[PDB]
Symmetry: C3
Subunit: 476 residues, 3 copies
């Protein structure tokens, strides 16, 4: 009549790495690394993104006629630019501080387009009906931006223009306008009558006075002239004032903005689908339940922390064998014991049988669960971290931004990789010691029997099922 102390074994092929040994097969484990995505752009928590499509932000904000899809867009979760987002300023010219404008829009959660200077009434002394061009052609007729008004002279007079707008929206207002540089003096006079004109735009936080220059630039969309585009964010209660003797591409529509938290701009060619997610990358959406991911650095939503690891497997059970206990004097696990991690086997006159010690097993399960959750809890969820954009004269800032991203990426990959290596080694020694503690618990309790040596004990006396379950209960 014998009893043995032993541990659990199963058919698991899970391997984990530890600080002392690599690829160790264990009975239970949890993967902490997401390495897959669904290959779709999804809504974030139910809110669709804004797909700029063939338009870029400039074409969107200016109101390029090819971007009319976007005019009613007022609410989105993030902004998508594709490889075909090429429709921008149809009348050629540069947007000043374009990357800053994009950075501003990347946190916008609500966008309300309104007619800041109504076309029909704002400009009684000028002509509002002729500012169209073949460069902004739409459905076979010369056209122009939906959000700007190309004002020209009325008759043969362009009087001094002055127009103010006071923001009473209760939110900041995005105002856009332009300054036109004709290619010849004849075009200057034809459009604006006066020569040597100026355009001045002012608020309490903004001031710029421009003198348009006449220069013939290389032809883009038949245009040797240029329009330089400008924008500013007007605060509640602040007043923006336009003054011009010509060349003013006036605001027609502007946008009352609310800023949110979880949005950004993403560059992706993947398709939007009517799926939803808490975490989106340019390649596809992530499930976002594990603390780490190696799919993409650019995330939007509440996302696992990005690491360069290819695997982050955490040991929870013990070494799978189907302080000298596991693979020691107790040379192997019991696949026959299924209800727990540590337990007993007994040979009897009434028959054989495995039983698991729930007391020590639950303590081990409680401790390891606390270990895993602590590792998950100490890792922070990676709120929206989008891409950042730099112009061609910002290489040092771009490289500074790149050094930051790469430095934290190395730090977090190191911390995760070493934590799992060290915690896995400690977890296996934890189980090893609990078995050794359980072996000594019966040995220091049957001391009437002799240590067979292999985790077992031969009872020098008859020991029935009552006698067995008594030793297990700790009351023997």
């Amino acid at each position: 009549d014998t009893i043995c102390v032993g541990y659990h074994a199963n058919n698991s092929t899970d391997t984990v790495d530890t600080i002392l040994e690599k690829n160790v097969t264990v009975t239970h484990s949890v993967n902490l690394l997401e390495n897959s995505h669904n290959g779709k752009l999804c809504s974030l928590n139910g809110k669709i993104p804004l797909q700029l499509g063939n338009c870029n932000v400039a074409g969107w904000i200016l109101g390029n006629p090819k971007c009319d899809l976007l005019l009613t867009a007022n609410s989105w979760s993030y902004i998508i630019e594709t490889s075909n987002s090429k429709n921008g300023a149809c009348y050629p010219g540069e947007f000043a501080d374009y990357e800053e404008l994009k950075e501003q829009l990347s946190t916008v959660s609500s966008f309300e387009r309104f007619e800041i200077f109504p076309k029909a009434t704002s400009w009684p002394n000028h002509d509002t009906t002729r500012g169209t061009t073949v460069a902004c052609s739409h459905s076979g007729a010369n056209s122009f931006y939906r959000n700007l008004l190309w004002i020209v002279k009325k008759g043969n007079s362009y009087p001094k223009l002055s127009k103010s707008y006071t923001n009473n929206k209760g939110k900041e207002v995005l105002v856009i306008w332009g300054v036109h540089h004709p290619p010849t003096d004849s075009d200057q006079q034809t459009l604006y009558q006066n020569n040597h004109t100026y355009v001045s735009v002012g608020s309490s936080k903004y001031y710029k006075r421009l003198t348009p220059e006449i220069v013939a630039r290389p032809k883009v969309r038949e245009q040797a002239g240029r329009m330089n585009y400008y924008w500013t964010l007007l605060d509640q209660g602040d007043t923006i004032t336009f003054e011009a003797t010509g060349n003013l591409i006036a605001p027609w529509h502007a946008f009352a903005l609310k800023k949110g938290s979880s949005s950004g701009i993403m560059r992706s060619d993947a398709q939007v689908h009517n799926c939803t997610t808490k975490c989106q990358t340019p390649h596809g959406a992530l499930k976002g339940n594990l603390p780490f991911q190696n799919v993409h650095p650019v995330t939007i939503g509440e996302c696992p922390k990005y690491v360069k690891s290819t695997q982050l497997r955490m040991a929870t059970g013990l070494r799978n064998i189907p302080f000298g206990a596991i693979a020691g004097f107790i040379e192997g696990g019991w696949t026959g014991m299924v209800d727990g991690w540590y337990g007993y086997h007994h040979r009897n006159e009434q028959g054989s049988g495995y039983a698991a010690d729930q007391k020590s097993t639950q303590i081990a399960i409680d401790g390891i669960s606390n270990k895993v959750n602590s590792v998950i809890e100490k890792m922070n969820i990676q709120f929206t971290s989008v891409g950042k954009e730099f112009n061609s004269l910002e290489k040092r800032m771009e490289n500074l931004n790149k050094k930051v991203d790469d430095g934290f990426l190395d730090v977090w990959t190191y911390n995760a990789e070493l934590l799992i290596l060290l915690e896995n080694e400690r977890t296996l020694d934890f189980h090893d010691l609990n078995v050794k503690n359980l072996y000594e618990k019966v040995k220091s309790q049957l001391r009437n029997a002799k240590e067979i040596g292999n985790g077992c004990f031969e009872f020098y006396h008859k020991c029935d099922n009552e006698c067995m379950e008594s030793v297990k209960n700790g009351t023997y």
Copy 2:
């Protein structure tokens, strides 16, 4: 009988471990400072500079409302409040203002000096009429203390030319302005000439401006504007001013000394006659622990800022009035009666004691653990806030990504280090107890740690001789 056992007391202190939360321990040491004195103090005896109702612009330009600041020549740090609103009393823009503040944040002392003495520097122009209602002082039109509004003498404004070579042995902050009158009549009244220019040149700075007659909306009755400019003139370098009008000339400049411990702070807390080695905008810190969660903005030698609400490190053992079966094992509880150490013996014969040998080794080891964690933690020298204009959002967000990124790293390092070291410290005591039992067992068994043998013989067993 002799019993091997461990210490227990009346402590309710709890610590977290990687395996268990809320573990009551007999001894522990706080590593997280979470309180402040609500005061702005001197740094090691050095008074801060309270700008009060003035901001940096008003101080540097010399807004007449900032005259009381003129007696300040050395400070430990600079304070702006929610009411620091007195700046440019004559409206207009300060160029590269966030850079000027960045430069001044490491200045600990400066010397205001009369770079172009008003009485002698401008013989061919008028220095006696450059006042405005916009800069009123005591009910009279006035002007900046550090700039001079030069106008025409009689009906002529000749070409102005003046140089200054910095021989102060320090960088000199030079400030000036260019006036943009609102009407051609005002241009003629003040400067006679039209189509004027102002040029300012040194070996590291060059700018030629043509003033523009423009009617801006009235601020403090002024439809005109003054644009302010500054530069740091190196030792041995020369700055040259040239103008046919519209020059708001330097009158006073500042020879700067940069110090190791100083910054600009935004705070509404009051200055008091306290001193501190570590200051935040909310109040001063004691600065004894390696971590603090009061504020990211520090001045002095300060604990590292973390987001943690508790950083509790175990030094004693589980408190019971485990891994190795001794503590919370066969010895089911601690001895409140044993007070002289962590591990020891209780004996009973015909006529509690602490094992000083076993206790001292563990005390020596745990002190080393705690000290190592403190020494590896570095003092956080002065880290102030940075400022960005409304067209510097990307840089502002890059700066914030850096602050937040290192903040998350150090919060992780502190919290997880404590979580893992607490587990090892409790397992350390548990193992030291099992070793004390097995040492007695290897000499002489009831089970709970417990020939006639009096005191000489027992105390010998404690001594290890039997």
Copy 3:
């Protein structure tokens, strides 16, 4: 049963105790260099020597040796790199220019506007100056052409170049601001000139201003230098009525890996290295270095540590009832003299795995040298320094604390292997005691 002892005096720290003598250990810190500037993976660096980048790119005549430079591994500036714009003036966006050149792997100088044929209506033979004197004769930059009037006429200049090289072309030019109206008329005839330079990504129209600046090398005038990167298929167009210091040679560029500009006075030698610092080359085999924070190549992480000694063996059970090690046992870590290859090889495999894991998870720094900020970029400069210093503290902390914690685990690791060997005879001899059969484990 016993453990190994030898004559090593190596000391290591652990979280629980400092200065513990160990039988074997490994240093994880490279703290020495060969005091030489070497080639990187086989590619010679570019020594600017007494020229700075401006003098190199403009083609200051004192920089003629550099004209053959087409491929380098990194660029070296010395404390005597002072030959720049010999005719005084500055490059707009000069730190950006340097940042662009810091990543260039191929450089092909070509004659964008051939001086003998590009300017038939202007004079190409008089744009020389005592300020750029060479071999006792007035001279000028090798890469720019100082065009002046032909006879008494300076007609409107118009020259385009279309980039068809299939790679970016660095184009450089200048705009001259004479000190007096007489010099303006003498050089360019016209009084109210302009220079406009345009591509699809660049446009600037400048009106030169006649101003007498302080004399630098006898020049009261100034030349403002400009640069741009012209994309494939794009056209740059120059138009001017005077004051144009025109392109003469430009540069077809290929972008390479993340090398940089180094400030160093060490001498270049015919050595090669995987990792270079301004003080000297590193062997680059260990995961950490404290030689210099400025690295180029595949380099160990920079730390503030003076020592990073990792225990691999045991202290010279241990230091308990067994009051000492056997200096006489030489064949292994544990044994009975004979060493147990099972017990010793298992520990060697594990400790070798621990050492390798610390090294394997450590990444190369791959940093960048010479981040420069102008005098109005102090906030950006301080931001860059906050990043460098912040990671320095993190890695110094991670390295030092890792070594403290793993050393304690290593010394207890050996201690437990001794107890397991000691218990190995007890679970074998049973009650037959108070040889090769016990060692084999079959007794």
